Design a protein around this ligand. Structure first.
Ligand code: SAH
Lengths: 13, 213
């Protein structure tokens, strides 16, 4: 299974 | 507000910084690309309105800081970072000058592809770009052939009660002129020599981190 990173698209920094 | 980074003042220091990146990019059979590249997925597939439950919009002021940072990298004013090999982590990225809180570090770059074309990909550095309701529309950044500093940055161990204390930057996705873009921003003031760390699982939990230091 592939393992990629994820980041949010809401809530800012 | 986003802050532009401060490039090292000594040109020889900026060369040594670029050198460590060129070296690590070479060991990985990679070319340097400080942009998203679109075969795989066309630029036209990257639409922020396709993100499930929407994507935050980068302000005019922050797009101006992003463009300024982009223009700085183009002329040789790279951010003050060093690619350093570590016995426990492999390639890592450390601050080589002060990096203030809210400073734009880098954009996560590489070839853009459909998650469906990379379901059996061994790349330890794949990053989500667009998360759409239709899985045939979801995008991912693939720095296996070309990339920048972002792919060498370390992640935190999400299993231990204290690995969050190592985190000094955050990865975020913003809509920039209607397209999904992935950026790294300092969440606190980072001193010269501090290793950079962010949460590889800032939204989905698709990265195994149990063995991380
Ligand atoms: N906190 C940490 N501890 C241990 N390994 C880590 C880590 N953060 C990142 N890594 C390593 O880095 C990979 C993500 S890609 C980061 C660049 C990589 N170290 C390289 O040499 O090309 C992970 O799969 C893991 O092998």
């Amino acid at each position: 299974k592939a393992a990629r990173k994820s980041a949010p698209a809401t809530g800012g920094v | 507000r986003l802050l532009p980074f401060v490039s090292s003042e000594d040109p020889a220091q900026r060369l040594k910084q670029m050198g460590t990146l060129a070296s690590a990019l070479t060991e990985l059979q990679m070319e340097f690309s400080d942009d998203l590249t679109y075969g795989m997925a066309p630029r036209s597939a990257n639409q922020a309105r396709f993100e499930e439950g929407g994507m935050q919009v980068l302000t005019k002021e922050d797009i101006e800081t992003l463009e300024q940072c982009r223009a700085m990298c183009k002329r040789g004013d790279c951010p003050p970072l060093l690619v350093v090999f570590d016995s426990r982590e492999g390639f890592t990225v450390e601050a080589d000058g002060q990096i203030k809180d809210m400073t734009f570090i880098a954009e996560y770059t590489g070839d853009v592809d459909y998650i469906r074309n990379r379901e059996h990909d061994d790349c330890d550095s794949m990053m989500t770009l667009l998360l759409a309701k239709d899985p045939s529309s979801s995008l991912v950044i693939c720095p296996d052939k070309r990339g920048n500093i972002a792919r060498f940055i370390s992640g935190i161990n999400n299993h231990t009660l204290d690995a969050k204390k190592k985190q000094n930057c955050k990865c975020v996705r913003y809509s920039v002129n209607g397209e999904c873009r992935v950026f790294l921003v300092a969440t606190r003031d980072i001193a010269k020599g501090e290793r950079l760390y962010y949460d590889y699982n800032g939204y989905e939990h698709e990265y195994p981190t149990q063995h991380f230091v």
